[PDB]
Paper text:
Btk is critical for the generation of calcium flux in response to receptor activation, because it activates phospholipase C-γ2 (PLC-γ2), which produces the second messengers diaceylglycerol (DAG) and inositol (1,4,5)-trisphosphate (IP3). Btk dysfunction is the cause of X-linked agammaglobulinemia, a severe disease of primary immunodeficiency. The Tec family kinases have a lipid-interaction module attached to the N terminus of a Src-like module (i.e., concatenation of an SH3 domain, an SH2 domain and a tyrosine kinase domain). The lipid-interaction module of the Tec kinases is an extended plekstrin homology (PH) domain fused to a Tec homology (TH) domain.
We determined a crystal structure of the Btk PH-TH module bound to IP6 at 2.3 Å. There are four PH-TH modules in the asymmetric unit of the crystal, which form two dimers, similar to those seen in other structures of the Btk PH-TH module. The four PH-TH modules in the asymmetric unit have six bound IP6 molecules, each with clearly resolved electron density. Four of the IP6 molecules are in the canonical binding sites on each module. At those sites, residues Asn 24, Tyr 39, Arg 28, and Lys 12 coordinate phosphate groups on the 2, 3, and 4 positions of the myo-inositol ring; these are also the key residues involved in IP4 binding. The two other IP6 molecules in the crystallographic asymmetric unit are bound at a peripheral site. This site is on the surface formed by an elongated β hairpin involving strands β3 and β4 of each PH-TH module. Residues Arg 49, Lys 52, Lys 36, and Tyr 40 at the peripheral binding site of one subunit coordinate phosphate groups at the 1, 2, 3, and 4 positions of the myo-inositol ring. The Saraste dimer is formed by symmetric interactions between helix α1 and strands β3 and β4 of the PH-TH module.
Residue numbers in the entry: 2 to 14, 21 to 80, 84 to 168
Amino acid sequence: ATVILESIFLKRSSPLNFKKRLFLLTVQKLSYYEYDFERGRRGSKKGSIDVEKITCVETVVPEKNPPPERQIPEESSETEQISIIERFPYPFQVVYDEGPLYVFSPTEELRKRWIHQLKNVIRYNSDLVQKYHPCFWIDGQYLCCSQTAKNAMGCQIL
Ligand SMILES: O=P(O)(O)O[C@H]1[C@H](OP(=O)(O)O)[C@@H](OP(=O)(O)O)[C@H](OP(=O)(O)O)[C@@H](OP(=O)(O)O)[C@H]1OP(=O)(O)O
Ligand SMILES: O=P(O)(O)O[C@H]1[C@H](OP(=O)(O)O)[C@@H](OP(=O)(O)O)[C@H](OP(=O)(O)O)[C@@H](OP(=O)(O)O)[C@H]1OP(=O)(O)O
Ligand SMILES: [Zn+2]
């Protein structure tokens, strides 16, 4: 039940919005929670995914004109301290039965760390896919294949 990885990520998904969440990875589950900054501790649980139910973990093609909150910097005035909890420019994908979960990492190294660990723990899942969507699902379709089913088969082999 011990946590393998712990990070603050920007989580996405009608109405599409982005919230800061504390992500936890164990061998069994990935849970995400609210972060109580005022008291500096983990807050209320918001979601949990069975690791064995995950079918795909990959990066996502970055959006074209992203808001500052997802754009790399002024980090001379702002230390890494501020930017590492305000800027989340690197997205990756976590696909399970309900569909794709989109998560934004503050650094490339941290995304690399999480994708690597995730791949390790899902290595024996029965349903790993062979095709996936490298582009985000938005307003009823994937931007990579124009397919309008959230669980439509992937259009790219990797
Ligand atoms: O408005 P937030 O504080 O961002 O919470 C949202 C909101 O959930 P709540 O109604 O519980 O506040 C979303 O719900 P809708 O706007 O779809 O009604 C919900 O999505 P789901 O109910 O569809 O699960 C989403 O959660 P998620 O992105 O896990 O789907 C969840 O955001 P958080 O789960 O990240 O707090
Ligand atoms: O939030 P945690 O401290 O990680 O507690 C988890 C969590 O339980 P709750 O979030 O409901 O308290 C798991 O529950 P879910 O994510 O399914 O809702 C549950 O996992 P199981 O589904 O396998 O019961 C698990 O129980 P366990 O570790 O006995 O497997 C339990 O951990 P605790 O027993 O430490 O509360
Ligand atoms: Zn596609």
